[PDB]
Amino acid sequence: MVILDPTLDEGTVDKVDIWGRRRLAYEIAKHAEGIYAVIDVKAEPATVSELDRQLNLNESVLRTKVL
Amino acid sequence: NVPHGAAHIKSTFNNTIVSITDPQGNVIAWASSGHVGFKGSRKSTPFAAQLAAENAARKAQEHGVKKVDVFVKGPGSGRETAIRSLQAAGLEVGTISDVTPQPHNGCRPPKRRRV
Amino acid sequence: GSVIKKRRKRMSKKKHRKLLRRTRV
Amino acid sequence: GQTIDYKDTALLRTYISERGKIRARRVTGNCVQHQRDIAVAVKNAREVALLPFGS
Amino acid sequence: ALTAEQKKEILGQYGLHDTDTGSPEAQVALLTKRIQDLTEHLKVHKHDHHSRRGLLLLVGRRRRLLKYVAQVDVARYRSLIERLGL
RNA sequence: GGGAGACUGGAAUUCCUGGUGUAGCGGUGGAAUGCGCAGAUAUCAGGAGGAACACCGGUGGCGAAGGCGGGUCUCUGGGCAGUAACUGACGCUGAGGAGCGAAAGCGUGGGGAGCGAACAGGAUUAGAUACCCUGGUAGUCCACGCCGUAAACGGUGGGUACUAGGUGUGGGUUUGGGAUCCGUGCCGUAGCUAACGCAUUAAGUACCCCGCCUGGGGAGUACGGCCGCAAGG
Ligand SMILES: [Mg+2]
Ligand SMILES: [Mg+2]
Ligand SMILES: [Mg+2]
Ligand SMILES: [Mg+2]
Ligand SMILES: [Mg+2]
Ligand SMILES: [Mg+2]
Ligand SMILES: [Mg+2]
Ligand SMILES: [Mg+2]
Ligand SMILES: [Mg+2]
Ligand SMILES: [Mg+2]
Ligand SMILES: [Mg+2]
Ligand SMILES: [Mg+2]
């Protein structure tokens, strides 16, 4: 199940790509700017449901998406 | 004194309010068309805002604001008359821009008036 | 097409449905 | 392609206006396939906060 | 409807000869597992009305094949029902 | 944009707390009731909460119809084309019957910004139980039931074969162009129609099956019976 997670804050993982630095178009929970970390997973659907529950809560990464 | 500032021209169908301000949003003085004299319909005029925005352009001069950014809110007559009488009184225009709040289908409006 | 037919058929419904508010007991 | 995703902003800056709203198929002359894949990818990139909703 | 590997299991089991597929003894076996999947789906979701329309068309399609098999030969009709259960 | 479930986003409206301010705001054909001088509207901050999802976007798509647009992942139904392997007329319609069926309304319990029937005050007027105006409860929303109606309309039942072409647009497949099967629009010959118009998606030429009609009113009413908690159908 090929799926991609980009993540922003300042079970086989196929790649990791920190782009590192762009400006945000609008300001997100105050702040400005941030990291751009595309995680590029190859994991199954059920686990990745509760990956986001781990990954959302820490606050290390400001926002999540999935593909 | 506010040496550089910002103006907010709300022009409704029934009124115009011109309020000159600093960039932080703390108003110095203001003028409406009803403040000049008028009652009822004559607040809504093309002329209304021309005479009011001179009364808004001064009082800015009392504190001493010599350049002012412009912000047009609302649909209504006297878009030009607010802009031009700010130039004609004093304080030459920095920048002009539309700030009419478009909703991304927000609340539902009132029912259709049929006259 | 023309709405004389339905305006004729309308006034039967109005004057019926007034009774079923009145009778209603 | 010209592959179309929400990653490449240099694509999406073409098909967006300066006031930040999506260009018509009448203006550009895309397929209906591609106007779907652009407008979804803009709406994705709008969540990612690469692009604004209007300047 | 089903996954590609899953479909061959019930197909090869119930099929009269090999590579038969569309024979009505083989064909009802596909519908029965498909209905068994969707009856679990509608236990969860409940107010999925549009998917339930599909379910009735599977059952309506299945009962016409049960009508056909009964008319042709009665031994295969009963052997169909014995194994699956209807 | 076919369905359902969860997570989630920004614009905008209203209200609460502070920052700046002074006396007007709002509304109209013109006004007043109203809100404000105990600091309103305007303007900048952040904050709680609900509902809808601007452009993309339309003679476009999908669905049996009702209908369905924020974004992502689950779990899902149907449709179309293609070579051909397989079963071997299993098809078509469908009285009663059963299931889906906008909006309104109804029962129990939550929620509540903006709208808002009834109701109140202002204006209009000969009168105003109205149009216009300020405020505004049911409601609109959410979850489980309930009725079962709409200009529920293409006012055109479902299936199948044949009968010029001209052009647009959506999904394919095949050999920048020609074919080919499905969709969906606009002109138009023969043909049909009382006429308007339809016209390869028929209202044309035919065959199977169901529904319904037999002057306008009384009336989709009475009475009996069935369904419904009720309104009622
Ligand atoms: Mg083959
Ligand atoms: Mg019947
Ligand atoms: Mg409703
Ligand atoms: Mg209710
Ligand atoms: Mg009202
Ligand atoms: Mg009817
Ligand atoms: Mg309709
Ligand atoms: Mg008729
Ligand atoms: Mg026919
Ligand atoms: Mg024609
Ligand atoms: Mg009756
Ligand atoms: Mg009776």
Author numbering:
A (entry chain F): 1 to 10, 29 to 85
B (entry chain K): 24 to 138
C (entry chain U): 2 to 26
D (entry chain R): 27 to 81
E (entry chain O): 2 to 87
What does the paper say about this structure?
Mycobacterium smegmatis is commonly used as a laboratory surrogate in studying the physiology and pathogenesis of disease-causing mycobacteria, including Mycobacterium tuberculosis, which causes tuberculosis (TB) in human. To gain atomic details of mycobacterial ribosomes, we first purified the 70S ribosome from M. smegmatis (mc2155 strain) (MS70S). Next, cryo-EM single-particle analysis was employed to determine its structure.
Mask-based refinement resulted in two improved density maps for the MS30S and MS50S at the resolution of 3.45 Å and 3.08 Å, respectively. With the MS30S map, we modeled 19 proteins and more than 90% of 16S rRNA residues. Compared to the E. coli 70S ribosome (EC70S), h10 and h17 are distinctively shorter in the MS70S, while h9 is about 17-nt longer. Notably, there is no density present at the expected position of bS21 in the 30S map and no bS21 sequence could be found in the M. smegmatis protein database. Interestingly, a rod-like density, which is absent from other known prokaryotic ribosomes such as the EC70S, T. thermophilus 70S (TT70S), and Staphylococcus aureus 70S (SA70S), locates in a pocket formed by h27, h44, and h45 close to the decoding center (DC) in the 30S subunit. The close contact of uL41 with decoding helices, such as h44 and h27, may have a profound effect on mycobacterial translation, particularly in the decoding steps. For example, protein uS17 bears an extended N-terminus (~13 residues), which establishes a species-specific interaction with h7 and h9 of the 16S rRNA. Another example is the mycobacterial bS16 protein, which possesses a very long C-terminus (about 60 residues longer than E. coli bS16). The extension is not resolved in atomic resolution, but apparently it forms species-specific interaction with the globular domain of uS4.
